[PDB]
Amino acid sequence: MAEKLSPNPPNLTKKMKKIVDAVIKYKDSSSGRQLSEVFIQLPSRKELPEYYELIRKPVDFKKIKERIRNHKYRSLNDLEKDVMLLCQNAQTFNLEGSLIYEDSIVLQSVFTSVRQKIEKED
Numbered sequence: 001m002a003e004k005l006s007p008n009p010p011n012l013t014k015k016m017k018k019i020v021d022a023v024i025k026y027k028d029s030s031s032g033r034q035l036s037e038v039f040i041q042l043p044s045r046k047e048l049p050e051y052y053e054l055i056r057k058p059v060d061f062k063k064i065k066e067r068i069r070n071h072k073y074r075s076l077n078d079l080e081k082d083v084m085l086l087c088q089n090a091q092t093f094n095l096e097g098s099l100i101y102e103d104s105i106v107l108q109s110v111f112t113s114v115r116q117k118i119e120k121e122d
Helices: 010-025 035-039 049-054 061-069 076-093 099-120
Strands: none
Touching: 010 035, 010 061, 010 076, 010 099, 035 099, 049 076, 061 076, 076 099
8 A cells, every 4th residue: 555755864853742742731720631632543433424514624633654664744833733733623613611622722732832842942
């Protein structure tokens, strides 16, 4: 099947993984809820058919991680786009003010600050 992609510069792959790991690890300081936890693994098309009806380009953090390992992302812009899509998809499928919709909003901000921090190191 698929033809292997040229590996990214390793430093770029390490930056990608660092950023997504901080995002995934992030905790609401009050509840300790890992905001990411519901976004790790999207539910099956068999279990939640209506999801895949409204959301044409679904994405979870498992796929984002896969896409980093496979060098599908060629830049941090490419990674960011997919995390922002993850958050947009949440905001489309869930009603505003809901736990999942508002958590996705916070995760955008955590991505942005985490990215900045990591890029400011080099």
